[PDB]
Structures are given as C-alpha cells and as structure tokens.
Design an enzyme around this catalytic site. Structure first.
Site, PDB file in Angstrom:
ATOM      1  CG  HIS A  76      -0.511   0.284   2.524  1.00 61.95           C
ATOM      2  ND1 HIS A  76      -0.326  -0.693   3.478  1.00 61.95           N
ATOM      3  CD2 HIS A  76      -0.207   1.440   3.118  1.00 61.95           C
ATOM      4  CE1 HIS A  76       0.093  -0.126   4.600  1.00 61.95           C
ATOM      5  NE2 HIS A  76       0.175   1.168   4.400  1.00 61.95           N
ATOM      6  CG  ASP A 129      -0.238  -4.008   2.650  1.00 61.23           C
ATOM      7  OD1 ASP A 129       0.313  -3.488   1.653  1.00 61.23           O
ATOM      8  OD2 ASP A 129      -0.605  -3.357   3.648  1.00 61.23           O
ATOM      9  CB  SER A 135       2.642   1.574   6.363  1.00 61.99           C
ATOM     10  OG  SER A 135       1.310   1.779   6.819  1.00 61.99           O
TER      11      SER A 135
HETATM   12  C1  LIG Z   1       1.449   6.626   3.865  1.00 59.91           C
HETATM   13  S1  LIG Z   1       0.796   5.056   3.453  1.00 59.91           S
HETATM   14  O1  LIG Z   1       1.324   4.667   2.183  1.00 59.91           O
HETATM   15  O2  LIG Z   1       1.000   4.196   4.577  1.00 59.91           O
HETATM   16  N1  LIG Z   1      -0.802   5.230   3.252  1.00 59.91           N
HETATM   17  C2  LIG Z   1      -1.717   5.477   4.365  1.00 59.91           C
HETATM   18  C3  LIG Z   1      -1.940   4.196   5.144  1.00 59.91           C
HETATM   19  C4  LIG Z   1      -1.468   3.901   6.395  1.00 59.91           C
HETATM   20  C5  LIG Z   1      -0.618   4.722   7.274  1.00 59.91           C
HETATM   21  O3  LIG Z   1      -0.818   5.883   7.529  1.00 59.91           O
HETATM   22  O4  LIG Z   1       0.430   4.049   7.709  1.00 59.91           O
HETATM   23  N2  LIG Z   1      -1.852   2.610   6.749  1.00 59.91           N
HETATM   24  C6  LIG Z   1      -1.588   1.916   8.011  1.00 59.91           C
HETATM   25  C7  LIG Z   1      -2.661   2.119   9.059  1.00 59.91           C
HETATM   26  C8  LIG Z   1      -3.784   2.865   8.772  1.00 59.91           C
HETATM   27  C9  LIG Z   1      -4.780   3.075   9.712  1.00 59.91           C
HETATM   28  C10 LIG Z   1      -4.687   2.523  10.955  1.00 59.91           C
HETATM   29  C11 LIG Z   1      -3.561   1.743  11.317  1.00 59.91           C
HETATM   30  C12 LIG Z   1      -3.441   1.145  12.596  1.00 59.91           C
HETATM   31  C13 LIG Z   1      -2.344   0.397  12.918  1.00 59.91           C
HETATM   32  C14 LIG Z   1      -1.329   0.204  11.998  1.00 59.91           C
HETATM   33  C15 LIG Z   1      -1.418   0.738  10.740  1.00 59.91           C
HETATM   34  C16 LIG Z   1      -2.531   1.530  10.356  1.00 59.91           C
HETATM   35  C17 LIG Z   1      -2.606   2.090   5.706  1.00 59.91           C
HETATM   36  C18 LIG Z   1      -3.229   0.856   5.581  1.00 59.91           C
HETATM   37  C19 LIG Z   1      -3.913   0.564   4.413  1.00 59.91           C
HETATM   38  C20 LIG Z   1      -3.963   1.516   3.422  1.00 59.91           C
HETATM   39  F1  LIG Z   1      -4.631   1.218   2.273  1.00 59.91           F
HETATM   40  C21 LIG Z   1      -3.354   2.748   3.511  1.00 59.91           C
HETATM   41  C22 LIG Z   1      -2.658   3.044   4.684  1.00 59.91           C
END
Ligand SMILES: CS(=O)(=O)NCc1c(C(=O)O)n(Cc2cccc3ccccc23)c2ccc(F)cc12
Ligand SMILES: [Zn+2]
Length: 219
Positions: A45, A89, A175
C-alpha cells in the site's frame, strides 16, 4: 509508534525511511527494511510513482555521515495485492545500487514466541505528529481470534499483534516496518483501527518466502 521508546541511534541498522511521490501529487512516507544490499521489503500500500529510500537514519530531519539515500529503480508489488481486503500487503523494492554495509546500515536475516518488537517514524498517538526520531515498542503476538473483528483477517496470511489491554501499537506512519521476534523478521506493518486500539494486522512474512526468494533470484 504508540507507547514506545526512542531507539538507541542506529541500533536497528536495517531500517529504511521511504519517501513516495504519489502517482497523483504530493509525497507520502513509510517504513521498510533492507534484506539485501539492493533490496528493501515494505508494504504494497506504500506504492507510488517513484520512491527514495533513506538508510542509516535516526532523526529524519538530520543528515548524518551514516546516511545512504538511494532511488528505487523497480517496485515489485505482490501480484495478488488486493486493495479491498488488503491481503498480500507486501512489496519488494530494488535499489538503483547496492548499499554500503556499515555499523549504521545492515541487512536483516530471515514459528515465533509471544514477545516481538517493531520500529518506525509514524504517529505517537491517534492525532499526534509523526516522530522525527526512530521509535520502537515491544508487542505481544496474539491468537488470530483476537483479530476476528477485522473482517478480512486471515491467520494463514497475517499476524495479529498487540495486547488490547495496553496502548502499545504500531500506527499510521509505521507502514512497511518489520516485526522482529527473537531477532528474526516475522511481520510487516499493514493496517489496524483508526482509533489505534490494538491489535493491529501485520503481513506474515513466512507465507511469502517463495515469492521473495523468486524475485531475489531473478534480480
Ligand atoms: C502513507 S501510506 O502509504 O502508509 N498510506 C496510508 C496508510 C497507512 C498509514 O498511515 O500508515 N496505513 C496503516 C494504518 C492505517 C490506519 C490505521 C492503522 C493502525 C495500525 C497500523 C497501521 C494503520 C494504511 C493501511 C492501508 C492503506 F490502504 C493505507 C494506509
Ligand atoms: Zn546518528
């Protein structure tokens, strides 16, 4: 990282900070980790138009002599990555050239006990800023039942990570970061609840070892 501690500088020398130019417009940031001199593992992602990897960093606003900053030349997003379910992922990044192995820059080697650790530059709370410094936290590997509230959770594909009785968690900004259990990479930060309530969901690295080995053998 929520509820963690500032890492000892350069104590996790496999950690990569990723700057991703979004296929649309501005930049986003992820973690990742160096598994070979010219390969980084991260989450699917985190993909985008173009990627820079920073190795050897602690405080991301502070260039040091330890830094190696490398352009990604090829993104290998998992072919079955599913934007809806978030299955598979995982993504391999080939670096334009090989990293110099130093004390501050090193590769991470490939079932786990309960206590694991994760590091990252992500948010320190629900509505908090990202961390300029590398943070880390110790987390409990949970039974898959603890993640049954995540509709698309699959025990074969993913780890369930973080004791819900505590605030300790990976979060947004983290992430692509590795989960180490006893010094071995077992997981990759994927997703969780937007209210930061543990557990979170990590990609189970072991399931993808055939695919990883394939890409490494051919590149
Ligand atoms: C900058 S990016 O490329 O990472 N995009 C945004 C994004 C994030 C993030 O901000 O890292 N996460 C992780 C995340 C999200 C929300 C809650 C979380 C609680 C725990 C761990 C991880 C969590 C995604 C998951 C699925 C997705 F499609 C997009 C994102
Ligand atoms: Zn330093």
């Amino acid at each position: 990282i929520i509820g963690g501690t500032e890492s000892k500088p350069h104590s996790r020398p496999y950690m990569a900070y990723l700057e991703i130019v979004t296929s649309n417009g501005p930049s986003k940031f992820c973690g990742g980790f160096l598994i070979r001199r010219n390969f980084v593992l991260t989450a699917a992602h985190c993909a985008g138009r173009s990627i820079t990897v920073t190795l050897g960093a602690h405080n991301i606003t502070e260039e040091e002599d330890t830094w190696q900053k490398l352009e990604v030349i090829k993104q290998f997003r998992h072919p079955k990555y599913n934007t809806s379910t978030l299955h598979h992922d995982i993504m391999l990044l080939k670096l334009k050239e090989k990293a110099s192995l130093t004390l501050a820059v090193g590769t991470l080697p490939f079932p786990p006990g309960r206590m694991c650790r994760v590091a990252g530059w992500g948010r320190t709370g629900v509505l908090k800023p990202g961390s300029d410094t590398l943070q880390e936290v110790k987390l409990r590997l949970m039974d898959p039942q603890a993640c049954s509230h995540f509709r698309d959770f699959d025990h074969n594909l993913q780890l369930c990570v973080g004791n819900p009785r505590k605030t300790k968690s990976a979060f947004k900004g983290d992430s692509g970061g590795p989960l180490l259990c006893a010094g071995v990479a077992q997981g990759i930060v994927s997703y969780g609840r937007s209210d930061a309530k543990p557990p979170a969901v990590f990609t189970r690295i072991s399931h993808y070892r055939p695919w990883i080995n394939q890409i490494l053998q051919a590149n």
